[PDB]
């Protein structure tokens, strides 16, 4: 019941109400609190930023006879890895490792991301790499995520690369986090035919590529200057079968847009209304902007009107363009 109730207190932020249950049950000894407790207090204060209490409840427990586990380091290494402080997870680390606590793969993989947030060069993440693995690290789905997402983090383009092929070569790739990861990554370095590859192993993966990735790889082709790149990724997006709305088409018209002829703009308008995608009034402005500058001051008054009965608010720069293209006209 005790730890029903701190769980309760820390979904609702309610951490001086919990650390008074705890230093009141601290005293009763029908009540004695347990490790259990003990972890869930300090991970109460260190979601509230409360590292100088938190520290004072884990010093406490070796003088209330309260069993330290390898959770209560991990928390430890987390909190101090939310702040940037690596140096403070690493000595952490060192510190359980010679207090004979053998770590675990989550503590492993809290310290890497704790390395790779406050910007430790690749090769300290390499080296608590091979450490882990020398010690018969295990693997997992958010664990590979992670080691994805490190390299990413690097910044280095052989890092990139390395992260980009480690879901490929191995076998082993998660469905979107990883492509993802390996996506962003090989965007900074350049990806000459990884922009492509990264869509296709997420689509043939086993699952259909995702709203969110398929727009993410046009907005990097767009980003690029490919229009053929963002045309393909877009039927791509809707061979899929994902449900998306108009964030890729709003792309395809800023980027048709930039061509001028905004012909494939007008089409993807046209087949955002046929597909019922989510109508962004952020889109409504753009497109017109784009067209009311092109001519179409009769087809922008159009739009208007339309606008009108659509129910969409408008605002600042929807009014602006259209009465600019109005005045133009």
Not at 187 to 194: A, F, T
Not at 262 to 276: A, H, I, P, T, W
């Amino acid at each position: 019941d005790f730890s029903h109730v701190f769980k309760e207190f820390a979904a609702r932020g309610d951490w001086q109400r919990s650390l008074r249950l705890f230093k009141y049950m601290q005293r009763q000894i029908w009540c004695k609190p347990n490790e259990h407790i003990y972890t869930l207090m300090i991970g109460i204060l260190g979601r509230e930023g409360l590292l100088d209490k938190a520290f004072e409840i884990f010093d406490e427990m070796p003088s209330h006879s309260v069993a330290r586990t390898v959770f209560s380091y991990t928390a430890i290494i987390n909190a101090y890895g939310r702040n940037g402080q690596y140096g403070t997870s690493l000595q952490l680390l060192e510190k359980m490792k010679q207090e004979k606590i053998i770590p675990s793969i989550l503590t492993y993989n809290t310290v890497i991301n704790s390395c790779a947030r406050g910007g430790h060069e690749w090769e300290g993440l390499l080296s608590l790499f091979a450490e882990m693995r020398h010690e018969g690290i295990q693997p997992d789905l958010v664990t590979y995520n992670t080691l994805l997402s490190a390299c990413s983090s690097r910044g280095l383009g052989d890092e990139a690369e390395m992260v980009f092929r480690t879901m490929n070569e191995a076998g082993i790739l998660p469905d979107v986090t990883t492509y993802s990861y390996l996506v962003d990554t090989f965007g900074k370095l350049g990806k000459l035919e990884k922009v492509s590859e990264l869509l296709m192993e997420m689509e043939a993966g086993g699952t259909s590529p995702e709203v969110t990735s398929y727009n993410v790889l046009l907005e990097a082709y767009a980003h690029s200057g490919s229009m053929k790149e963002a045309m393909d990724v877009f039927r791509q997006m809707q061979t899929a079968g994902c449900v998306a709305n108009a964030e890729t088409y709003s792309v395809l018209l800023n980027l048709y847009g930039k061509n001028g002829r905004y012909d494939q703009v007008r089409d993807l308008f046209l087949e955002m209304k046929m597909s019922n995608t989510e109508p962004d009034a952020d889109t409504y402005n753009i497109l017109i902007q784009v067209f009311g500058e092109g001519g179409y001051f009769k087809e922008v008054v159009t739009l208007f009107h339309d606008m009108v009965e659509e129910k969409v608010e408008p605002n600042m720069e929807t009014y602006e363009g259209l009465i600019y293209a109005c005045g133009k006209g």
